RNA sequence: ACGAGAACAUACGUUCUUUGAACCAAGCUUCAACUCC
């Protein structure tokens, strides 16, 4: 479903943590590990 | 047996007349009712 045209936003619908977030700038990895450390340790 | 004796510096009279504590000025700026399992 990508790329369409793209015109597509995510409106709040409990769209997930990473729609809310930004910091997948700007490569794959370190990222993943920094948001995998930083919601998914402390709990 | 004094250059002395007697004699209110007194009477009358509004600190008073006219005068906006005013003029200008967004309770506003930036925010996802949300994330996780």
């Not at 769209?15 to 370190?30: E, I, M, P, Q």
């Amino acid at each position: 479903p990508s790329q369409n045209q793209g015109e597509i936003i995510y409106i709040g619908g409990g769209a997930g943590f990473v729609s809310k977030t930004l910091h997948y700038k700007s490569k794959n990895r370190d990222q993943a590990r920094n948001d995998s450390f930083d919601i998914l340790k402390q709990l």
